[PDB]
């Protein structure tokens, strides 16, 4: 998702689907840096 070589244009977005996984996101800390990250409906400290 994050490391994909080619991204879509904004007028035709991908809309991928995900299931059957554990969602451990600390595996991103080393590789990527985000300038924006905001969550709605949930607090970012409960995501684990």
């Amino acid at each position: 998702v994050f490391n994909a070589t080619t991204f879509a244009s904004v007028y035709a977005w991908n809309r991928k689907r995900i299931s059957n996984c554990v969602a451990d996101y600390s595996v991103l800390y080393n590789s990527t840096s985000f300038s924006t990250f905001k969550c709605y409906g949930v607090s970012p400290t409960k995501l684990n």
Partner: protein, 48 residues
């Protein structure tokens, strides 16, 4: 027009992207493993 009690000043250097993580209730490598702030935090945050 106020008089402050128990004043402390903490100082460090981060990269530009991770400035947004110095706030109560955040997640990321800096908030998780380096520097954490209380939920009931009274004070001010300055960065340049």
């Amino acid at each position: 027009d106020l008089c402050f009690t128990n004043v402390y000043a903490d100082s460090f250097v981060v990269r530009g992207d991770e400035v947004r993580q110095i706030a109560p209730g955040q997640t990321g490598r800096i908030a998780d493993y380096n520097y954490k702030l209380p939920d009931d935090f009274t004070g001010c945050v300055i960065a340049w």
